[PDB]
Amino acid sequence: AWPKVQPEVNIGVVGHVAHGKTTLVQAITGIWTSKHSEELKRGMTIKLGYAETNIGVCESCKKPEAYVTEPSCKSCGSDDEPKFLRRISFIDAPGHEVLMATMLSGAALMDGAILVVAANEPFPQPQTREHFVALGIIGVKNLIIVQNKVDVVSKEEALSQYRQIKQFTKGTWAENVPIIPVSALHKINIDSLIEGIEEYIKTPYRDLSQKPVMLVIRSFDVNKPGTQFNELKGGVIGGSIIQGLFKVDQEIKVLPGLRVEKQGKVSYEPIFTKISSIRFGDEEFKEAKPGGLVAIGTYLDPSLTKADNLLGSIITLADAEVPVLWNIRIKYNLLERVVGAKEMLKVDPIRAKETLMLSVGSSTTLGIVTSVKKDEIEVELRRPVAVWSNNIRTVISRQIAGRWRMIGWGLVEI
Ligand SMILES: Nc1nc2c(ncn2[C@@H]2O[C@H](COP(=O)(O)OP(=O)(O)O)[C@@H](O)[C@H]2O)c(=O)[nH]1
Ligand SMILES: Nc1nc2c(ncn2[C@@H]2O[C@H](COP(=O)(O)OP(=O)(O)O)[C@@H](O)[C@H]2O)c(=O)[nH]1
Ligand SMILES: [Cl-]
Ligand SMILES: [Mg+2]
């Protein structure tokens, strides 16, 4: 048997709408990540999807068939148990152009990524480009490009697009990233992709002694009908631990906290609570480390956590010092053009009084520009943000023709 452990790495799955991201995750994990009503109705990912799998290798078999996702080597002709390598997880992003803020929020949780490119669609589609650019900006450079749907193109067509893709990455940070052809739908060459994941998306070094920080992407009321008449189960908060570690019974706080009234004005009150339970997937643990999306059980009134109320928050230890800022200063750079549009228009300089959208960690916030300089802006936010380190990446978006468009990035200065 394989050990039961948390995932140790998060692999993003990104790319243009319907190119096959969710089907790819299903091919690897057996899981269909879409679980919301609207997602099932539209056949499209809307919220961040999530799935885990164990990875092992059959030492008696040849690669890539030696790589397996369950404790059996029967697939490559061996009765031996495969050697366990690690448990991995996938962050399945929405690829729709209007959902970029959600993709960006998930990118903050990625240790590496797969860019899925459909072989039977013109290359490069708008969100093939946009997600590629966003990965580079956020620094998710451990990338595999997957050429999907090769089952419905000729070999000649596949090779032609392959050349296209290599030329696209030529002269970029991604010049040497591998391109792996698969059919997610028919599970062809998935073993090569597993081998690729092991080679190119290694588990990164972690800093377990740094102040614990979890970025929140979900929060739940897990109380359900038909269960016993005791007091309500506490609110559950979901996200990814980006540094340090958390343990059951630890005093924690949620930042910025709860929107409340104080002295006639809107304020944010840090939410203090204690960790009651820790879960990854269907399994409980006594502590939680970077890697995987974790469910932190708390003693909070479920009304405080219901329906992703705490999305964009962070969790730290109760006594930790973390800046919570209503006004931020960003050392920024602008992209040359708007890559996510079907026609790439030039990016205009940032002007004072503009309302911009800021992606910081898992949070997405609107604010007004109060000051513009050559490499520096100041922004008055509609809601404060937790800034847990001195040089955190932010992505800057502007509303252009009714859509939020990524136009730049920078560092939040504290
Ligand atoms: N022919 C073929 N169709 C695929 C493949 N992968 C996905 N699809 C189809 O493409 C459509 C969109 O797939 P989905 O996984 O939801 O793409 P996503 O929007 O990028 O997550 C669905 O009808 C899939 O069945 C493939 O490898 N070959
Ligand atoms: N830490 C903790 N997590 C929980 C508990 N109950 C549910 N969860 C997690 O909260 C998330 C949402 O809960 P639920 O609506 O029941 O999800 P589902 O049962 O997997 O469809 C899931 O990822 C669960 O793993 C709990 O008692 N403690
Ligand atoms: Cl999509
Ligand atoms: Mg999808």
In the chain, what's the furthest Cα-to-Cα distance?
72
Residues in the chain: 414
Q: Among 33, 216, 279, which is best to mutate for testing ligand 2, by the most ligand atoms less than 8 A from CB?
A: 279
Q: Are residues 13 and 117 in the same domain?
A: yes
Q: Which two tokens stand for residue 109?
A: 């949780």
Q: Which of 206, 229, 252 is the last residue before a domain boundary?
A: 206
Residues 6+ apart with CB under 8 A from 96: 17, 44, 46, 127
Q: Are residues 38 and 130 in the same domain?
A: yes
Please work out whether the CB of residue 44 comes within 6 Å of at least one atom of ligand 1. yes
- Among 414, 407, 346, 343, CA closest to 378: 414
What is the rounded distance in angstroms from the CA atom of residue 101 to the CA atom of residue 80? 46
Task: Give the number of domains in the chain.
Answer: 3
Q: Please report, in angstroms and rounded to a whole number, the separation of the first and last CA atoms in the chain.
A: 48
Q: Resolution in angstroms, to 1 decimal, for this deposition?
A: 1.7
Please name the method used to determine this structure. Answer: X-ray
Which atom of ligand 1 is nearest to 182's Cα? 27
Q: Are residues 124 and 74 in the same domain?
A: yes
Q: Are residues 60 and 199 in the same domain?
A: yes
Q: Are residues 57 and 23 in the same domain?
A: yes
Q: Are residues 118 and 263 in the same domain?
A: no
What is the rounded distance in angstroms from the CA atom of residue 372 to the CA atom of residue 348? 13
What is the rounded distance in angstroms from the CA atom of residue 108 to the CA atom of residue 110? 6
Neighbour count for residue 347 (Cβ, 10 Å)? 18
Q: Are residues 230 and 270 in the same domain?
A: yes
Q: Which of 206, 224, 250 is the last residue before a domain boundary?
A: 206
Q: Whose CA is nearest to atom 28 of ligand 1?
A: 149
Burial state string for 126-163 with b = 16 or more CB within 10 A and e = fewer than 16: bbbbbbbbbbebbebebbbbbbbbbeebeeeebeebbe
Q: Is 9 helix (H, G, I), strand (E, B) or coil?
A: strand
Q: Are residues 68 and 131 in the same domain?
A: yes
Please work out whether the CB of residue 158 comes within 6 Å of at least one atom of ligand 1. no
* Cα of 60 from ligand 1 centre, angstroms: 33
Which atom of ligand 2 is nearest to 281's Cα? 25
Q: Are residues 304 and 327 in the same domain?
A: no
Burial state string for 29-50 with b = 16 or more CB within 10 A and e = fewer than 16: bebebbeeeebeeeebbbbbbb
* Cα of 84 from ligand 2 centre, angstroms: 26
DSSP symbol at 230: S
Give ∠ CA 347-352-356 in degrees, rounded to 5.
60
- Cβ atoms of 92 and 119 within 8 Å: the answer is no
Please work out whether the CB of residue 121 comes within 6 Å of at least one atom of ligand 1. no
Cα 309 to chain center, whole Å?
A: 18
Q: Among 42, 185, 188, 192, which is best to mutate for testing ligand 1, by the most ligand atoms less than 8 A from CB?
A: 185
Q: Is 70 helix (H, G, I), strand (E, B) or coil?
A: coil
Q: Are residues 156 and 242 in the same domain?
A: no
Neighbour count for residue 279 (Cβ, 10 Å)? 19
Please work out whether the CB of residue 302 comes within 6 Å of at least one atom of ligand 2. no
- Cα within 13 Å of Cα(369), Cβ side: 20
What are the φ/ψ torsions at residue 290 (nearest 5 degrees)? -55, 150
**What domain range includes position 115?**
1-206
* Cα of 322 from ligand 2 centre, angstroms: 28
**CATH code for the domain in which residue 227 is found:** 2.40.30.10
Which atom of ligand 2 is nearest to 233's Cα? 27
Residue with tokens 């922004």: 379
* Cα of 313 from ligand 2 centre, angstroms: 19
Q: Among 17, 23, 114, which is best to mutate for testing ligand 1, by the most ligand atoms less than 8 A from CB?
A: 23
Please work out whether the CB of residue 181 comes within 6 Å of at least one atom of ligand 1. no
Q: Which two tokens stand for residue 88?
A: 């991995």
Instruction: List C-alpha distances in Å: 92 to 77, 96, 109, 383.
Output: 32, 12, 11, 27
How do strand 112-118 and strand 143-148 relate by DSSP bridges?
Answer: parallel
Q: Are residues 50 and 129 in the same domain?
A: yes
Q: Which of 321, 342, 364 is the last residue before a domain boundary?
A: 321
SS3 content of the chain, % helix, strand, coil (to 5): 20, 40, 40
Burial grade of 70 (CB within 10 A; 0-12, 13-18, 19 or more)? middle
Q: Are residues 34 and 160 in the same domain?
A: yes
